[PDB]
């Protein structure tokens, strides 16, 4: 009954019969088969790929964030928030550690201060270097500074993102947004950035499934040692683009998502499959599902 | 237990029997029973019960 | 005051000889002291003697003014309005009476005659009053005429059978038996139109408490405030947090309706218009660097600068007088044209005084109804907003709608009083106003005398009103104040119907399923087994446990004065908001009102729980709750609390700790046999096997078990500070377990209702089948009534022969068994008993 | 108990995607299941050639294996919505009989006793918590099914097999052939190829 | 700095307005009293003893609306348009000197708020006198000004109008006299102690699409409901 | 927020030419120096922070409904401790009535 896997009293049959869209599905799932048949034999290979595809947005790595009306100049001592005035100690180290990442000349009067959750960085196995590249690859209109990756408890890791003037030059002709409004809109974009995963799936497990295959002697044999990925949440197009997943054999549990990307004939086969799953084994004949 | 008759008290508005044993009326062949009889193909039974025995009449249309 | 009594050491109590069958004497004593429906009789009795007189003499004072719509005359043309002012002085209710033949002298009406003739078992209500009529002239003077009206009968009020106003209360058991009544029944029902009706117990949220629920509104917080007493008028305030960022306070009551006001407007109208002080009442400190206050202020700062379309003109104003005037002209229903009265400065003063009189009497009346406690309400109102914002921040979860820590069970006295209020002003007060309106229209005010005024008052209350007052109460009793017809299947059903707690009657799929389940707060107060097994009513009806009761309102003034006289409690006027968060003071509540602060919340509750054990200072029915999550102490004495007796468990942890200290001190001195200074832990109850034998002999009751500090009454919100052993064996198993220190020891049968105790070895049966027996045992043929030949009942079955089961239970000590000990063979015989059929001997 | 000991020393490291609370609950549910050995004492106490209760279950006439185990061996873990008894009694207590943040499995719905031996008060309350769900879901199995049944029929009833064995709505094809084979559900035989 | 209450400022202030000193001393305590009694000073409540006495807030509210309105005149140039209570008398002024009046007008909010919050917690009785005395000395400060010549007539009018409105606002909360009750526009006129026209639905406990447990699309007779028993 | 000196009202914050300027409804205008450079902030995992349970952790040794454990307190050498399990990561804290508290706090 928990969120994301709600299969309590009638919900899933209501999701099918009412043709509810993918956005209203409380128990959507998806089965992904590895592209390489050799890889699907090994569990560890399928285990790391399953953890590779898991939506870790930048928001969930944050304990707290602060929006500051500050500009950074290397030489000129600009005003800084008194509770965060100690941040300048690691700012000097960053400037002397990155002789190529110098502050731009169009930094706006807007600063986002971030304090990473070091516990989540350990459990999810996310390095500081990976986060920096992901944010700099997605947000070219910002300048990002970070503290040192520390292995000693009690000293946090600080991410500092400076908004450039081009962040407002995107669309400021629509004057119905003060500079405070754009900055709040930018931090929402920064927090919802995707890091190490594909959007739409929150959990990706590893399951054992059984398949048939014709041998070299024409014999049909059951293969039991086949590993795949069963995810919580549905995104056919997201797993479509992955190079570790066979795009031809993506099995979604969403009728609307299968209809959107495959068509009405594949959506017809999806309705039959989903009703049968609800019907269990003491279910009706197949012709009633058609 | 209940078993009434071929005829008895009748609703003034719909012309159907009254409700239940208490009013000495008939028993209900509800929505779900016409579904079953239609599924079985029992159409002459529906005529006998829903028309001959409940309120069937003759309507004249130009 | 500090406790002084001391009991014998727990190491000398001999309870190794106790058995579970000996602990049934505790349930016997609890039921004998409680009775089975004694709360119903007590509730109707204090509704009769105390409730209705107070409601009539306090909450029905009439002060109205009406236009003089007469023609032209010297006095007429010169006068414009007449003020009708009256109140009721003497109120009483008598036993039911009936008029024999015609023009007799109102002989007594016995309940059986009312049942047979289809009459009403209602007793007359006599009221007395004084009336003042004030007529206002154009020049400026006024004329006042005052008249005292002799007491008269207005109508009849329904009377519960077996109560103080019933005729079957001054009669012996033999006389009750021989007048067509049931000598073994306790009563507790109403006779109306030849039918017997039961006013069921009602679940209701706890008053003077904040209920925080999620939902356009982001969050919602409700607070119903009652100034003290079951019969006082209650006013609720709803604090909503909208998606726009605006915090609005809405007061729903007898004078306001559905008017959402920005939160800071309420603070401004009471003289505190400075925003820094207004914010301080919510965050308790502007100088705190805590990350909670940063979240608090950020929401509060944005809320001030949100434009309210209805309260736009006064949003930016700091003059409290105009804000009161702005609200007064908005809520007063007699103002139809603005600025027509603003020219007159006396009309402006009238609306200002009226609004301040209303607001002081309607905004958090439990904190006071005078103008002295205006700032005191603002401190409490800011606390309520602070609690709501703590849930938006997800620091605290929303209020659980199913837990009984925040629920009350209201009997017949509370329910009938609520219906009485809405009927009395409609069928009595309104006709009098109409009667006086027509009197002044047809006669000059100066021409009236003492005789005319009294005539108009009584003539207006004709038998149209007398019929209206009595029959509307009967309609409330019949229509259902949730009531049901008393169907007499057997004695068990009659008792179980009077011990039934009903809920108010939503469509939310999750909400409709959660409320039908058994909750963790039920064991001991609500039967975990008794419910409907079929249909929409599965779990919608609840049954009191065998030892559960319903407490009445206590004498709150005695405890309130002692708390204020306690040197360990600082009065609310002696502490600042900064003195609370900087020194870490603990707020102290009594019946939901905030009266002061204490430096040690745990020690205050511990010291007052120990004082309750003597009973000479703190009443045994006082709920003392210590909230260890927010460090607050709450005292509850209101009516509607379910309570059950729990045997107190005492230990020697004080001596055990000293032995640990001495053993450690010996080890630090290099001593080898340091372990010899330790003593074993001992926890035990003071209930001895001799006490069980004394309960059975009638020389030991529950009242004097409480008086000796052996058992105490525990309330569901007080049960959250208790660790209870489920049986005397679990207590004996953990007798020397220091890591599990129980506060009370339970009797296992106390968790089941009366109907659920009929099933033998119910713990050995599947629990869902125990639920079925509760439904099946209540529809069993038997001696449905001991006075069946005197009754003309519909669809009733009287089974001739009944037997006590060979394996009986404790439920048969209170109700007559219904059934026979049939010899049953568990066999296959011909296939006629398949699919849940049986084969019955024709002989 | 030893899973709790690992928790006390902080030796429970959840995998990627699971919190420590969710991983701890998963470990407890797995560790509190009766093994297949539970029937060894059960079958040694009965004579299969004369036991009426066993012959009713073994032959499929009435009952199942969990019924005998509950009657004779033990009820086990009460599991509502595939999880243990959540604490609804004042922030960490499941009932008034157990302390806050209790670690023992009995506090979370593990019934150690069988029906033939009788349950205690806390075990009966947990059993009533699961028993009430059966009554609630049985009531919903009528109304909720009826809501879905009526909507399904009113959408599907217009489909009638015509003279071509097609399924159509008065002119409009829904199926080119009923069931894509043109056969009746009552006239089917299960045959191996 | 030792603060001491000065009764001479109230006497001087009352003489200017041609009103009794009791009117000034009764700011916030006029509720429920006849203004004639207030004018004579009869029935004056005793000095406050609790820090939660609404009189302290009532007097403080009167002080801050004097300061709020004074600063509106002081910063009249910053407004898009001045409010009503300051615009009709500065209308005849020119913009360059309307941009002025923030240099020639002294500030009168020097240390009021800090001291009042200290006195309220420490001794409520002295706080009520301090707030009243502060209002009088501020009025005298704005009335004893003499230079420059072009500002004397524009601020003394402001000082009298503000103190009169503060007194009048306090006066409109006192006990009303005699008036025509039908000017409100309706027949009935109730008071705050009336229960005849209370809301009927408010006597009950205040407060409160498909029903999942209702057999509404299940067509089964109500007399044969035992077929739905769980058994 | 910034409270007006004159009328003690909540001043409105705007931004002009690289500076934060507070303007009030009474015309008083001031500019913040350092402590007003905080446009907005949010704190995550508010349901398991240490400031949430400070009062509860302090009161735990005296609450009789908390789970005890047979371990020696290193300060007073009492042979039992109070064990609490807070947060979604199930952080275990051992507390005693003498002031001892595991995690060194
Ligand atoms: Mg059946
Ligand atoms: Zn201001
Ligand atoms: Zn210690």
What is this structure, in a nutshell?
The structure is cut from a larger assembly and holds two copies of chain A, two copies of chain B, one copy of chain E (231 residues) and one copy of chain F (105 residues). Chain B has two helices and no strands.
Write a structural description:
This is part of a larger assembly, with 2 copies of chain A, 2 copies of chain B, 1 copy of chain E (231 residues) and 1 copy of chain F (105 residues). Chain B is built from 2 helices and no strands. Chain B is 37% helix and 0% strand. Chain B has 62 residues and is mainly alpha-helical. Chain E is built from 9 helices and 1 strand; from the N terminus they run H-H-H-H-H-H-H-H-H-E. In chain E, helix 4 packs parallel to helix 8 (124-143) and helix 4 (54-74) runs antiparallel to helix 9 (152-171). The longest helix of chain E has 21 residues, at 54-74. Chain E is elongated. With 105 residues, chain F is mostly beta strands. In chain F, 6% of the residues lie in helices and 29% in strands. Chain F is built from 1 helix and 7 strands. In chain F, the strands form 2 sheets. A 3-stranded antiparallel sheet of chain F has the order 1-2-3, with no helix packed on it. In chain F, strands 5-6-7 form a 3-stranded antiparallel sheet, with no helix packed on it. Chain F starts with 11 loop residues before the first strand and ends in a 10-residue tail after the last strand. Chains in contact: A-C, A-D, A-F, B-D, B-E, C-D, C-E, C-F, D-E, D-F, E-F. Strand 3 of chain A pairs antiparallel with strand 4 of chain F. The PDB classes it as viral protein. The entry lists the keywords asfv, RNA polymerase, viral protein. The entry is titled "African swine fever virus RNA Polymerase-M1249L complex1".
